[PDB]
Structures are given as structure tokens and as C-alpha cells.
Design a protein around this ligand. Structure first.
Ligand SMILES: Cn1ncc(CO)c1-c1ccccc1
Lengths: 145, 143
């Protein structure tokens, strides 16, 4: 689908909250542990995302952190179309948790283990030895020239 | 320069620390406000960077934050070569001033500045933004 389309969700592990943005066309992920699923935390994560990739549209789970006017304000500022409650990706949250289990014993804190897992996911060749990683795919899809 | 070379810098503002990474060939920036310039905050910044972009080499200032065993452990794990030997960085500070009033806290103004820097077209019609350049450089290098 469009190069500018992201899906945002949340997943919970060890009592902490991980916000995950998936670039729908490529399966590339961005993720971070945050203190809680608040408006101010969600808006900050989105503003960081939109400053790093060209984000036109976000699909959300319509959680209350999304309905907040702080999130709406960020999205307006960044020119992002927020599509709440609009639905390979339900087992993205599952995929990321698995990878986190494989590195968890190399890091003292969960937040570091999440970043390791993001690194592994985005570098992973899919479709066997002849294939491409989510990382290669997102840049091929969004490059304008 | 090569597609995998970054330069990393700290800058100090309104009483806080900003870590700034410039992708040298594109001028694209990543930045984060951190409470203090520690070896743990550095390593965490570097790992987030390397899971996002193909980081092969980072050029840094001499600081002990870049020297610490945790940054060395992160660099070895992520495959980053470290080397301890600024026009997009004065630029970033200048943008922070121009929008500092658009926002409540520093953290937010910094990410608005990164947004504006990376999306801004340079030159006239036919030009590119830094965000366009990095993606183009790296996509070309893959093919
Ligand atoms: C209406 N709504 N609100 C939140 C969600 C979760 O995507 C949904 C939804 C669930 C399944 C299919 C379509 C929307």
C-alpha cells in the first residue's frame, strides 16, 4: 500500500509499555519503551517518527492516548492523517516479543533489549538468501530518485 | 562519503544535553534530548540509530561517554566502528530558536527542529531534502 502509511500499536511486557510503528509496505519497525500510554508520550513518539520518515497516514488502535488532543495537535502540525480504528502485523507484536526473548539476557534493561530486537527485525533477510530485509525494502519503496 | 558514516555530537541548551547524529553524505539528522551525557545514554542512542539506518562508522568527540564499556559493547554488537578523530549542527540550534515558542518543552522543540531540517527542500525546483538524500544514497548503494 502507500509508501506514507504506518500502523501504530502498543504492547506490554514486564509491566512496561512499548509503542511500535510499522511501515505497512515494508514490515520495517520503530519501537520504544515509554512510561505509560499517555497523549504527551504518544505525540512525542509520533513527532520523532514523522521527523525521520515521510509519514502521511497513521492507522491506530483508537486507544485513548490517540483520541487525546495532544496527539491530534502533533499530527496536524506534522501533516499526518490520523486514521483511528482502521486495521502480518498482529503477529508483528508477537514477532517483536519473540526477538526480544532471544536478546533479553544480553541487556541489563528491557529498553535496551527492545532496541536490539528492532535492529534484528529490520536487518533480517526474508524470502531466503535471495531476498531483502525490511530495512532494504523501506528505502527502496520510499526513495524518490 | 560512504553511505554508512555518521558524525555524533553533543550540544548544550536551556540547561540540558542534545545528542546529534549527522549522516555525513546527506546532512540528514537524528537527535534526542537526554538528562545527562552518560555512557548508557550514548550506547542506547547508538543502538536505536543502528536498528534504523545502516551504520558502519561513527565519528565522535573525545568524551568519556564514547569510551565507556557499554558503548564498546553496543558498538561491537551492532557492528559499528568507532573513531574519536559542524554546519548542520549550528543549523539545528538556529531552527530550535525559530520554533522554540511553538512548543512547551525543549524535548519537543528539538524534534520539531529535526522534522523541519530533514523535510526542508534545499535549492529551487529540482532540489531535495536531506531525508530524500539519505534514502536515495542508501537505496542506490543497495542496487
Ligand atoms: C472500530 N475499531 N476500533 C479499534 C479497532 C482495532 O483496530 C477497531 C476495528 C477492529 C476490527 C476491524 C475494524 C476496526
Amino acid at each position: 500500500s502507500s509508501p506514507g502509511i504506518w500502523q501504530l500499536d502498543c504492547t506490554h511486557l514486564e509491566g512496561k509499555v512499548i509503542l511500535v510503528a510499522v511501515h505497512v509496505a515494508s514490515g520495517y519497525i520503530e519501537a520504544e519503551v515509554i512510561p505509560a500510554e499517555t497523549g504527551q508520550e504518544t505525540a512525542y513518539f509520533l513527532l520523532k517518527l514523522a521527523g525521520r520518515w515521510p509519514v502521511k497516514t497513521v492507522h491506530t488502535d483508537n486507544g485513548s492516548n490517540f483520541t487525546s488532543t495532544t496527539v491530534k495537535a502533533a499530527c496536524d502540525w506534522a501533516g499526518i492523517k490520523q486514521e483511528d480504528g482502521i486495521p502480518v502485523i498482529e503477529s508483528m507484536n508477537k514477532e517483536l516479543k519473540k526477538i526480544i526473548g532471544q536478546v533479553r539476557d544480553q541487556a541489563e534493561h528491557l529498553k535496551t533489549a527492545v532496541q536490539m530486537a528492532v535492529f534484528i527485525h529490520n536487518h533480517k533477510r526474508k524470502g531466503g538468501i535471495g531476498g531483502y530485509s525490511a530495512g532494504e525494502r523501506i528505502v527502496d519503496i520510499i526513495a524518490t530518485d
